[PDB]
Design a binder for these strands. Structure first.
Length: 64
DNA sequence: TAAAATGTGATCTAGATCACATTTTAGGCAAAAAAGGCCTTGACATCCCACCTCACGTATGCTATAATGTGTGCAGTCTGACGCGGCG
């Protein structure tokens, strides 16, 4: 529920031209996910990669 | 009338005469040969060119304890008029 902070704030942002406030306020939305979300991001990544390795394994001339 | 000009005439004195042989020497006409003008040759000297050429310099890659929302040193507020967007 951080996009709705951006919502009303931008509704009431005092004509703030500086992109620093913009970007820094935008990263405030996403939080710090840790300790296995790291490991789970890794798991999903290596899974999809090993399945593009299925995708090479399925192609015959890959060995050629 | 002072002072310069004018006759004595015999005894001389440096150059001209005068026909012909021999030099010379032009001057100017033909030219031999030498020294520029033309080219060549050998020998040198210095390269331009470029063709390479290794050392030093340079473009790029990872480093696994862990660490996770700026600010930050400034401005000193000039001011009167005119547009324009809210602001009722």
């Amino acid at each position: 529920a951080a996009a709705q902070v951006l919502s009303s704030v931008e509704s009431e942002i005092g004509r703030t031209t500086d992109p620093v406030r913009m970007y820094m306020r935008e990263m405030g939305t996403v939080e710090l996910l840790t300790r296995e979300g790291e490991i789970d991001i890794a798991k999903r990544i290596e899974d999809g990669i090993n399945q593009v390795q299925c995708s090479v394994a399925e192609y015959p001339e890959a060995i050629t």
